[PDB]
Design a protein around this ligand. Sequence first.
Ligand SMILES: NC(=O)c1ccc[n+]([C@@H]2O[C@H](COP(=O)([O-])OP(=O)(O)OC[C@H]3O[C@@H](n4cnc5c(N)ncnc54)[C@H](O)[C@@H]3O)[C@@H](O)[C@H]2O)c1
Lengths: 823, 207
Amino acid sequence: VAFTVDQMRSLMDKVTNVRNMSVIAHVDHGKSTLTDSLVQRAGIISAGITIKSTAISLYSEMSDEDVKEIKQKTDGNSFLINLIDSPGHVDFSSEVTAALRVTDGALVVVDTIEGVCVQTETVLRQALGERIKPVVVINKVDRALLELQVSKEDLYQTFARTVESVNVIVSTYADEVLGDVQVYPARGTVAFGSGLHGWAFTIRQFATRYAKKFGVDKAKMMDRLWGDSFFNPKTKKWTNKDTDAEGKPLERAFNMFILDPIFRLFTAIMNFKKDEIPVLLEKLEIVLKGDEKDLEGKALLKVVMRKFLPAADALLEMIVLHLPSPVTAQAYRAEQLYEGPADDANCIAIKNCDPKADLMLYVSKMVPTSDKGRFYAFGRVFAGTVKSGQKVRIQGPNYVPGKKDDLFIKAIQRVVLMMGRFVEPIDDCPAGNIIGLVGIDQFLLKTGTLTTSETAHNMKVMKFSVSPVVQVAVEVKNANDLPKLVEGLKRLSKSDPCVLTYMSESGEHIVAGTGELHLEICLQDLEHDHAGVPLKISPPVVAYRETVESESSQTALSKSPNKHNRIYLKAEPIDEEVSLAIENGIINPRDDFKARARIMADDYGWDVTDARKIWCFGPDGNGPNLVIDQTKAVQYLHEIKDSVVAAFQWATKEGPIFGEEMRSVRVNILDVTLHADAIHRGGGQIIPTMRRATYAGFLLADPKIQEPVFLVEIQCPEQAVGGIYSVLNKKRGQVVSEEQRPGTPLFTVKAYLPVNESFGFTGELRQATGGQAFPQMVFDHWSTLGSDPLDPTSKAGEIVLAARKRHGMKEEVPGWQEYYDKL
Amino acid sequence: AFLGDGGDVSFSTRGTQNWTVERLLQAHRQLEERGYVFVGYHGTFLEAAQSIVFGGVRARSQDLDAIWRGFYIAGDPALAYGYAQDQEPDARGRIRNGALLRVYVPRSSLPGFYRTSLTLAAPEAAGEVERLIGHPLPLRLDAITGPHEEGGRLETILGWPLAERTVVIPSAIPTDPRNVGGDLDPSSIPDKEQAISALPDYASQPG
Ligand SMILES: NC(=O)c1ccc[n+]([C@@H]2O[C@H](COP(=O)([O-])OP(=O)(O)OC[C@H]3O[C@@H](n4cnc5c(N)ncnc54)[C@H](O)[C@@H]3O)[C@@H](O)[C@H]2O)c1
């Protein structure tokens, strides 16, 4: 259905008629299939710039008496349904939480035969922890009839057990502050059907049918169409007794009025009984058209079932009538989604879904767009209204009311509707609606909170890190395909802000990710989409850091190739506080050298003299490494500054130990002798000198290496929590805390896990917990190994040697004498 | 073709591709079998190496006095090693390691090789060199060997005409990508290459 920007706005205005929801389903249960039925039925089209589909807008219209059945405030017959996209596998835990956090309802898909799988169970558990209301649809009914050929009673009992299992999970993990949220078929919160053939139904749909043929309000008929209600065919009497006077079995209403009609069509059509089909179709008033009247077998069965019980209708019915609106849900989800006071002015504005109060927009993810390499911020307005041109307070993850850390007061260029793959610019957007923002990707990596009050805390933040902890070497198998890989890498780095593609000094094409899986999917996306050529990929390698933890044993000295220039320097460790401050923007390269110096002096115990003589950061001109000019009366010193800085960029990018980046390394240039003539002290002369002196100074400051460490947060039922510790105890894991959810048997275990010990972690944790555990790990900190990296037998040395060999370097680490002036 | 048997030879930061000590021993032998002799090393940057080995040594304008123009090589690879690297960085400040080249000439040119104790490329030596080669500078179909600086190592200058009759192949002595600017470690010189690196006996007296 095509709509104009105006019609959309007038629909987003009535928040009471909006449905923010997602779909919880296993990919093998026809998740995308049922989703297609919805978009092909109620999909909203608009009457240039493309984006990765993150959300879909649906439109459903109902009756005055249909809307009457809604136990929440409503306004009109029109309804806007936001279908938020969900990941395909549970392993993508971080983005599973992201989608659920911006939703209020959930369409949970469950298999007829297999019932509720472990994955869907775990996800529903999380959705309930987010205070999300569920509506169930039992899919793949077709398989039960066509393959298993079960009886009506057998099919019913199967649905019964299924519904039971779902409510066992619901009643256990659903928050007590929501009341009975269990699903009941008789109440229309459960649908049945087959996405494959595109048919589905609810008890309400059939109650509406027989409401007249029995002169009964569908409320009572609905109650009879499930459970122990029996309509005796011989006496035409309703009964609660499953046997007549003579003790003969009576068929339940569900089997008699719902299943039977379907079963008869399945039987007549699949048995090619050309004489029965017509009569059976007119009986149910199912009219065929031209070509359709000649179909047979599955072909015909799919057409008949499709127009008999359109799948999308049954789903939309539950979504509109039972799923909460932004208004309803935010009243009990506000406290939970606000990392601050419950009686706050903003938290209250979120409870009331107040479009007038201070803006409280939540950014769940950044979306790749066709507008260059820019990303549009996807999220939801929980309070106030976002506007084009409006200036907003961009509050990052590390932001806190008081400090100005991780804050960016900028202006929203354009606020747009995310119509799946396309974008539609609008003026504003009241609270309760999902929306996209243009011109923020340069302030928010992925998650963030936008406000308008100078006293507003961040909304429940989703921890994330861009730090490339794992990487691989990418290489084409066919030399001719090189150009295709070069552009494929530049493309891959644009479809994901957390992916890193760069070239090592040796020229290797490097692809680095945030985790084993994340990197895995990237390499598959590359070899099939971004590139499409047969690739040779090396095994996953962990990224380390080269550092020092003492001052150089002695002054480092190095000459230039022409022997006319000398650089004297000394290396020394930088405090972790300072390295963290640098990485967190506190101490900034682009900052005024005097403002920065004051900070380093007052807050970090630096000599303001040194702090004012910072020549550069590194690597990439902003890393946690510094060059300090401590020279005295060196003529023409400034004429080599650009060279010294450049050399430092390369020296810090790949260190002397085994080619890994430096961290927390401070270089003090103590003295410099230069040739009077500039001709003999250009980049070609200075660069190698500085770079070698640095290496020499580094090696003299007792070298060490640091390893990346994850912070793992795991949700798990008490029963299987024991498996969490079982796995961690052989992964050098360090338990941080074990907390239990009030009321439920759900535990949250947080622990540190070395990245180089996390390979295959989710798979092992899976088995150790029977799939009950819900992993979620983000980079936390670097950790200096105690062992000597120069000792090939030690842990650190063992790591170095293997790396050295792999890179084809000399096995033994070079002594400082190599880089020191040879004399 | 004087590169021996194997794959396509190319120059890289990672080292000279398809060039082993064994292949060198084959290329060297086959050179001598055709009346060629080894006269020293030439260090330079990768692109220059590619040009010199596949296109040949060609005359070019260089930054010195006209009379001393020619192709510069060193008997001791360590001296030539110092020039086997980029002289200018790119836009990002990258200074790549280069490659050591072996320089061969036709034995028929040997009578033109002379040696001196004087420091070359200096006006005080121009007279003695012009005496030795039997004509005024620049060098032509002849060569001169002597200290590249007082108390320094020996360098050889091939007259451009003579330089263009050379045959140049890669050395089995690698440059260090992780130590650009460092000195040549003798231990990194393959023992089997040192064995074929004896220099000819140069004349100390004019013809
Ligand atoms: N290069 C050496 O190995 C070497 C050996 C002994 C002494 N030296 C000293 O170094 C100084 C610099 O001499 P240089 O030769 O390095 O610089 P140069 O100015 O003499 O030559 C310029 C550059 O052009 C390059 N080139 C590219 N293609 C070429 C081709 N087809 N034919 C010839 N050359 C080509 C050479 O490699 C050389 O580096 C000399 O003054 C000499 O005293 C150098």
